[PDB]
Coordinates of C-alpha atoms and ligand atoms in Angstrom, one line a residue:
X8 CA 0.0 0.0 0.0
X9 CA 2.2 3.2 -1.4
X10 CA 0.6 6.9 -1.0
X11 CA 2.7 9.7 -3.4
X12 CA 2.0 12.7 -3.3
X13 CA 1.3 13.5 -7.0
X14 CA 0.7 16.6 -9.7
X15 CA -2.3 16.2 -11.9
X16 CA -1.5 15.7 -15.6
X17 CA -4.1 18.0 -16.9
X18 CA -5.5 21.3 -14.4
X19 CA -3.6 23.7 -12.1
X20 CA -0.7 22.2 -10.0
X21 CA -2.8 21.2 -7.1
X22 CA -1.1 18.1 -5.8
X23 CA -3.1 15.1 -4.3
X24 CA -2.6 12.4 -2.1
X25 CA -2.8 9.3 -4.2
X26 CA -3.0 5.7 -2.9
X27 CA -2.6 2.3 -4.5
X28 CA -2.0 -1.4 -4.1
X29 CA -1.9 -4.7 -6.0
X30 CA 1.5 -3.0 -7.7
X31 CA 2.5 -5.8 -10.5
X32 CA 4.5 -5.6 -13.4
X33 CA 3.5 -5.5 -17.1
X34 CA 6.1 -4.4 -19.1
X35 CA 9.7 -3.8 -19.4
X36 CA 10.8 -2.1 -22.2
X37 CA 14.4 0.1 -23.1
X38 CA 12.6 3.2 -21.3
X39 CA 12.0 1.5 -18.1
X40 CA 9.0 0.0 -16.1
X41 CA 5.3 -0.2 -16.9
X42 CA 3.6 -1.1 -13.5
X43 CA -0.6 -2.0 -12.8
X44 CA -1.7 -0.5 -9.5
X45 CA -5.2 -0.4 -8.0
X46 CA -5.9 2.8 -6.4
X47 CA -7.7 2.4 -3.3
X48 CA -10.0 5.0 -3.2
X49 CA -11.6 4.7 -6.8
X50 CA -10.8 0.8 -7.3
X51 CA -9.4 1.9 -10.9
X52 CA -6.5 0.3 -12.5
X53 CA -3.7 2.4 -13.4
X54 CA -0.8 2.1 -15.4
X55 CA 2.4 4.0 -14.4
X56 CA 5.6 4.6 -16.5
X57 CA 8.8 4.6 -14.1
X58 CA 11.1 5.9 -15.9
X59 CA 15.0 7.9 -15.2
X60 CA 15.0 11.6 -14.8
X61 CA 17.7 13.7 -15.7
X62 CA 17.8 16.9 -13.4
X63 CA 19.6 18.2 -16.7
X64 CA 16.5 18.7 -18.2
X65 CA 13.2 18.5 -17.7
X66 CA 11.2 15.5 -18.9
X67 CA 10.3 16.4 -23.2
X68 CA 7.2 13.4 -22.7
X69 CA 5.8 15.1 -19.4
X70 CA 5.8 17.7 -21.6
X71 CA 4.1 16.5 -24.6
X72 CA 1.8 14.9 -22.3
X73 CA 0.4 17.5 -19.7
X74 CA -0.8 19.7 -22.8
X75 CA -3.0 17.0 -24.8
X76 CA -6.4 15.7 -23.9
X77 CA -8.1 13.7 -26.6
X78 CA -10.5 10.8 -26.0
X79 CA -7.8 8.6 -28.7
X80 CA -4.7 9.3 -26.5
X81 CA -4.0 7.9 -22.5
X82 CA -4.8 10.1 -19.9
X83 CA -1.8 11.2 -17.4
X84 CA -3.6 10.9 -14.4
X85 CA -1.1 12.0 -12.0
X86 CA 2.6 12.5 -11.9
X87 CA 5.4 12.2 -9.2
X88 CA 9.3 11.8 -8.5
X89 CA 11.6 9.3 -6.7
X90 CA 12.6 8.9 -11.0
X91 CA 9.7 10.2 -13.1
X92 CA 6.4 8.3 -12.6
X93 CA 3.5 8.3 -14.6
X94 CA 0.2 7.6 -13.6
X95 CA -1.5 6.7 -16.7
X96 CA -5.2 5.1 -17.3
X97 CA -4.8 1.4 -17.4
X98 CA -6.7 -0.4 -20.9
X99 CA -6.2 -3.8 -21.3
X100 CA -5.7 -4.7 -24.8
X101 CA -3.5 -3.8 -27.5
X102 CA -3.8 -3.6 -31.6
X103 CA -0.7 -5.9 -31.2
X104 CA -1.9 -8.9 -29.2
X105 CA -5.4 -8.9 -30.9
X106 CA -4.2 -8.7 -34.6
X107 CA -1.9 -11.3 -33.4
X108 CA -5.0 -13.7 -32.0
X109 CA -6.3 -13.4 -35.5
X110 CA -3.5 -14.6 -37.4
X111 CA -2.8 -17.1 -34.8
X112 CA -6.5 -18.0 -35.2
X113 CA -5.8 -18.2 -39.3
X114 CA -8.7 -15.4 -39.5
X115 CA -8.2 -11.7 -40.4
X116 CA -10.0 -9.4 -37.7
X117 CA -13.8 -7.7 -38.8
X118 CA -13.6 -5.0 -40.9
X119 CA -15.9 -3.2 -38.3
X120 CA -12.9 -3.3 -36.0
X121 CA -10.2 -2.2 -38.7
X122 CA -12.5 0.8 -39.5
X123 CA -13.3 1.6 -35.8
X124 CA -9.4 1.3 -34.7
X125 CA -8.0 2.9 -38.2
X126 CA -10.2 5.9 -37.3
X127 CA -9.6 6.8 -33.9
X128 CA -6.0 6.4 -34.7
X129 CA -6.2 9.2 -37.5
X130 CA -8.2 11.2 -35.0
X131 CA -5.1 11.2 -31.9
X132 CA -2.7 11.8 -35.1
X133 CA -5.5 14.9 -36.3
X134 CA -4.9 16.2 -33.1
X135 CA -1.3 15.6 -32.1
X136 CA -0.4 17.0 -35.4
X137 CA -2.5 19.7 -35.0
X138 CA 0.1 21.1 -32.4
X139 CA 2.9 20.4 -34.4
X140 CA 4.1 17.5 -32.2
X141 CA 4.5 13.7 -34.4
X142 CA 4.8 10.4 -32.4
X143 CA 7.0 9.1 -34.4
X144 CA 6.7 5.4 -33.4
X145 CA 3.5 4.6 -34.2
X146 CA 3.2 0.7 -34.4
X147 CA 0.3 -2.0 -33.0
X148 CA 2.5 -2.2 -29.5
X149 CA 1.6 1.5 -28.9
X150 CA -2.3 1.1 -29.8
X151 CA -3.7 0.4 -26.8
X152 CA -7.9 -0.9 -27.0
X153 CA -10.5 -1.6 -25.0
X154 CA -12.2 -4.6 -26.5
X155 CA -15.7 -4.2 -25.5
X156 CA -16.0 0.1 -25.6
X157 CA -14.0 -0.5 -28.9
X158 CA -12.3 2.6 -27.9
X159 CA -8.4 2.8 -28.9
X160 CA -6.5 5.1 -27.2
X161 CA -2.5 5.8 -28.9
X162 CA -0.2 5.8 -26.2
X163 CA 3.8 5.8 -25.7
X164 CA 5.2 9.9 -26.1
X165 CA 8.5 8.9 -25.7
X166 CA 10.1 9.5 -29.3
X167 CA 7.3 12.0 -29.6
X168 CA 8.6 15.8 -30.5
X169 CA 7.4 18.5 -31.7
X170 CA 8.4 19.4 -35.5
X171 CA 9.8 22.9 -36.3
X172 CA 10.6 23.7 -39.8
X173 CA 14.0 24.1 -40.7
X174 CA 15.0 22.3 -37.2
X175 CA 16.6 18.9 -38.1
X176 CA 15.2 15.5 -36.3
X177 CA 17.0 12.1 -35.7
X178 CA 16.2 10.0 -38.7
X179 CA 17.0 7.2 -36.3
X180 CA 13.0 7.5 -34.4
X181 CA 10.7 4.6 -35.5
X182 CA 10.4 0.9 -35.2
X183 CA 11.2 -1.6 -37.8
X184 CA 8.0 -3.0 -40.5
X185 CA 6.7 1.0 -39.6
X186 CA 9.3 3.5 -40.9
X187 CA 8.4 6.0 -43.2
X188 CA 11.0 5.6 -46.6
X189 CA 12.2 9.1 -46.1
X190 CA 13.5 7.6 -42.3
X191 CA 15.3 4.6 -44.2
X192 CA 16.6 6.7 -46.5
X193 CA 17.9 8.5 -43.6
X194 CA 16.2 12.1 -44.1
X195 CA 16.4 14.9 -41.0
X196 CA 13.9 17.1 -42.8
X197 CA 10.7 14.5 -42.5
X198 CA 7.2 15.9 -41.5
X199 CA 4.5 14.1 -39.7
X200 CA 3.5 12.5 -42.4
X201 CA 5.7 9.6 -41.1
X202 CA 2.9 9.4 -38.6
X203 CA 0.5 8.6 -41.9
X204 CA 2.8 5.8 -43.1
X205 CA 3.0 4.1 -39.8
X206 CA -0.7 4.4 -39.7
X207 CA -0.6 3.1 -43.2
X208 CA 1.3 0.5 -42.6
X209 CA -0.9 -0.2 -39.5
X210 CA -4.2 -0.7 -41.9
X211 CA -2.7 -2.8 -44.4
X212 CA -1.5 -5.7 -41.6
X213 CA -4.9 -5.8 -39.8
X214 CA -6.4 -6.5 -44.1
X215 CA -3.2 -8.5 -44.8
X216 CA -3.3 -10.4 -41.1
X217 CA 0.4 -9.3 -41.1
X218 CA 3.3 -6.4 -41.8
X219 CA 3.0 -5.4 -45.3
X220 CA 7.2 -4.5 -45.5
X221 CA 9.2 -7.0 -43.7
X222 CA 12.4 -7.2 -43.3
X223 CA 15.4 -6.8 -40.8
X224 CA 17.6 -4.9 -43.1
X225 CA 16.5 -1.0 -44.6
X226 CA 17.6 -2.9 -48.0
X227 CA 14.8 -5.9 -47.3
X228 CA 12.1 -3.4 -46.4
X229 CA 12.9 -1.1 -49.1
X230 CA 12.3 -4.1 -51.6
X231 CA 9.1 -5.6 -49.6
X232 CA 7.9 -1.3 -50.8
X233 CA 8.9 -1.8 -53.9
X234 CA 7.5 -4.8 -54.7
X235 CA 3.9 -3.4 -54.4
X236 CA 4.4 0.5 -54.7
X237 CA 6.8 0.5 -57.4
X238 CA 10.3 1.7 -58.0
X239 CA 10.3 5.1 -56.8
X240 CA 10.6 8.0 -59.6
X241 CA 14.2 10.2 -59.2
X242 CA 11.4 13.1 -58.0
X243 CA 9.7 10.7 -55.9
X244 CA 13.5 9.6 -54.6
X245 CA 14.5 13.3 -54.1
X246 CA 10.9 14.5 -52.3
X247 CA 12.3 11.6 -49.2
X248 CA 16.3 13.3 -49.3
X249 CA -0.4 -4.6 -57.9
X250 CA -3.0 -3.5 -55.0
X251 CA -5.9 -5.0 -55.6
X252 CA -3.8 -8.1 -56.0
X253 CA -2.0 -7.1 -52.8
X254 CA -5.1 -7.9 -50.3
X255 CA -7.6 -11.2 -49.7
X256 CA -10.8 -11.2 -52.3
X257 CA -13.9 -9.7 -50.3
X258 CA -11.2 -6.8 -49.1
X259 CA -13.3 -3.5 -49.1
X260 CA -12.5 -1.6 -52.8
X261 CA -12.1 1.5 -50.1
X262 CA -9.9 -0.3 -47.7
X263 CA -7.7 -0.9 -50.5
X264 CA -8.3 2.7 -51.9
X265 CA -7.4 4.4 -48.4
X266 CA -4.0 2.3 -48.3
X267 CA -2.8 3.3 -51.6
X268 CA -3.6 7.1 -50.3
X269 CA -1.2 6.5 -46.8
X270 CA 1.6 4.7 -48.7
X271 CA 2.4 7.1 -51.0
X272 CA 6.1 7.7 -51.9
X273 CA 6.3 11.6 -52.0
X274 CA 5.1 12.5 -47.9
X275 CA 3.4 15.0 -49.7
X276 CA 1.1 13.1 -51.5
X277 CA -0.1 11.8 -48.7
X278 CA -3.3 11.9 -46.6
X279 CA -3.7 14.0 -43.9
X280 CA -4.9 12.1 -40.2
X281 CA -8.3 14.6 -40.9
X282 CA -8.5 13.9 -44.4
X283 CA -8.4 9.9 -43.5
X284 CA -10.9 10.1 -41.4
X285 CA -12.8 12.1 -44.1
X286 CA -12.4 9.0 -46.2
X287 CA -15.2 6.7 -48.0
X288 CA -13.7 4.1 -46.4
X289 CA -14.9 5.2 -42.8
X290 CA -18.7 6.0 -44.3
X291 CA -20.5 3.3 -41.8
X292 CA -19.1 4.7 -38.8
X293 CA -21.2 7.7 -40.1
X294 CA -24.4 5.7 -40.8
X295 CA -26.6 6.7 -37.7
X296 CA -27.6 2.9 -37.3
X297 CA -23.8 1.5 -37.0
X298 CA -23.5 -0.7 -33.7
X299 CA -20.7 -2.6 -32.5
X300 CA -21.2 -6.4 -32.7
X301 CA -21.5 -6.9 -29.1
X302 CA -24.8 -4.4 -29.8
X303 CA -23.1 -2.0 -27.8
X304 CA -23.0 1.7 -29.2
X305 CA -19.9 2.8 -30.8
X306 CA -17.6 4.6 -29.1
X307 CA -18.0 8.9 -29.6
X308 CA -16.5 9.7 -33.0
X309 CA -18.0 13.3 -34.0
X310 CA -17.3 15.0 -31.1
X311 CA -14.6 17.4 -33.1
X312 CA -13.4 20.7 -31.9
X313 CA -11.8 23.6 -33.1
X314 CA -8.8 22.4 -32.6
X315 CA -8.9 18.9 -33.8
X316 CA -10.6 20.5 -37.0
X317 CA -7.7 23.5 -37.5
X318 CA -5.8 21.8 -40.4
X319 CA -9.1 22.2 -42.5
X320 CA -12.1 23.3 -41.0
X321 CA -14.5 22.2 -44.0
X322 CA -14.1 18.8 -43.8
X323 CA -16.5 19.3 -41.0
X324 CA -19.4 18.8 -43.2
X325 CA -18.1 15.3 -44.0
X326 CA -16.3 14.4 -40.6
X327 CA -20.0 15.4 -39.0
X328 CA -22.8 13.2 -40.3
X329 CA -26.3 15.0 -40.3
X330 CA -27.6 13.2 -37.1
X331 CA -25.1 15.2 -35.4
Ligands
LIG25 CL1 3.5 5.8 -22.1 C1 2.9 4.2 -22.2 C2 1.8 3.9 -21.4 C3 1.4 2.6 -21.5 C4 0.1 2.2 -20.9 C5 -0.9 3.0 -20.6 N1 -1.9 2.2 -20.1 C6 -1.6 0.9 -20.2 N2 -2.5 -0.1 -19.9 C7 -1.9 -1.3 -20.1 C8 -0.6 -1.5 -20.6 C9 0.2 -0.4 -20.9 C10 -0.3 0.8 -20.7 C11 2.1 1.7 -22.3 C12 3.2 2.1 -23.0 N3 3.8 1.1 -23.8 C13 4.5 0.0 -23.1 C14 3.5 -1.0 -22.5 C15 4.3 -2.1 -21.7 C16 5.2 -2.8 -22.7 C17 6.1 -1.9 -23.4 C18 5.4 -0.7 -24.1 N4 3.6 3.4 -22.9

């Protein structure tokens, strides 16, 4: 039974007395520990990042976190010292281990799902980007879900900075199967459309029922591109510095349509998160009878402010369906 004395992520610094037990471990990444906890007064399960904290500076993912609050991103609940802890919400699944029941399973997960998770992914990146700030390490692992809500919530601010033109960036962010070509081909000058690859990339494995480019070498991932986008033209190569035979038969045209739109060589020609959500492909998350399969209602998905909406307000009239 452990009682901090802890900041609130979000609100004026008005520090609480916070108490929990049951404290078990769940992960163990580079970063450091992930711990569960049961706080005592509430009952609610918590997740909290322990991780080392350099008096040198002051914590760039406190940061990042503190400022956003999006119904698609974990909430810091609370914050302390020791070092840095983070009192996050706890959700139990991940894109990760259910794409991986699936394939396990030899099934692909309902398309219901892929739309539902794809768009509330586009919706965290909407926002995010919408501040300047890319996650860059956007993968399954870092898509945390709640199976029956069907709400996904991105998660993981660690490699997470905000993007300043003409400042260069580490082309050295970004996990393996996800990275954007511009990162293999080492560029400092990338955008947040890396973001919209990763999310690309994420789409395609949950049709596919797994990663689209492979590979444990740049080279091997650069061919598992090129075999379905093409070779890249010397404008295409220079803007970095098959698909209908890619996907299963009954694959959604739009599905299919929406990929080739993410996965785009030139990180210009991309999508925007906003203008993905906008897409045909998401149209029966709009219908005003969609309901999950569980009959439960789906999770809010309209609820867009000003902010959210900033990189192009008219998309409104799509991103809003009437019954709204
Ligand atoms: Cl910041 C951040 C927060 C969380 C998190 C928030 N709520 C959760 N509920 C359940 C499990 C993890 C979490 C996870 C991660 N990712 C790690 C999870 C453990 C294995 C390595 C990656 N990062």
């Amino acid at each position: 039974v452990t009682t901090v004395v802890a900041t609130p992520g979000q609100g004026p610094d008005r520090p609480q007395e916070v108490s929990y037990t049951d404290t078990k471990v769940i992960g163990n990444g580079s970063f450091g520990v992930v711990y569960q906890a049961k706080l005592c007064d509430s009952g609610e399960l918590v997740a909290i990042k322990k991780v080392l904290q350099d008096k040198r500076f002051k914590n760039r993912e406190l940061q990042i976190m503190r400022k956003l609050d999006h119904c698609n991103i974990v909430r810091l609940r609370y914050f302390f010292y020791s070092y840095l802890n983070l009192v996050l919400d706890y959700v139990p699944e991940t894109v990760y281990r259910v794409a991986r029941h699936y394939s396990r399973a030899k099934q692909t997960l309902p398309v219901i799902y892929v739309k539902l998770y794809m768009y509330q992914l586009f919706r965290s990146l909407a926002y995010i980007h919408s501040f300047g700030i890319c996650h860059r390490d956007i993968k399954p692992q870092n898509l945390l879900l709640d199976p029956d809500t069907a709400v996904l919530k991105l998660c993981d601010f660690g490699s997470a900075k905000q993007l300043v033109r003409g400042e260069p960036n580490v082309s050295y962010i970004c996990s393996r199967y996800y990275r954007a070509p511009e990162l293999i081909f080492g560029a400092t000058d990338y955008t947040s459309s890396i973001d919209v690859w990763s999310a690309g990339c994420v789409l395609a494995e949950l049709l596919l029922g797994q990663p689209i480019f492979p590979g444990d070498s740049g080279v091997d991932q650069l061919v598992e591109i090129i075999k379905v986008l093409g070779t890249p033209t010397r404008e295409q190569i220079r803007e970095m510095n098959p698909w209908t035979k890619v996907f299963r038969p009954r694959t959604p045209p739009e599905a299919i349509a929406l990929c080739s739109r993410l996965l785009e060589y030139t990180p210009t020609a991309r999508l925007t998160p906003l203008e993905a959500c906008a897409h045909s492909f998401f149209d029966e998350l709009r219908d005003p009878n969609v309901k999950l399969p569980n009959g439960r209602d789906t999770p809010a998905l309209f609820n867009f402010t000003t902010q959210e909406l900033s990189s192009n307000p008219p998309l409104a009239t799509i991103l809003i369906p009437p019954h709204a």
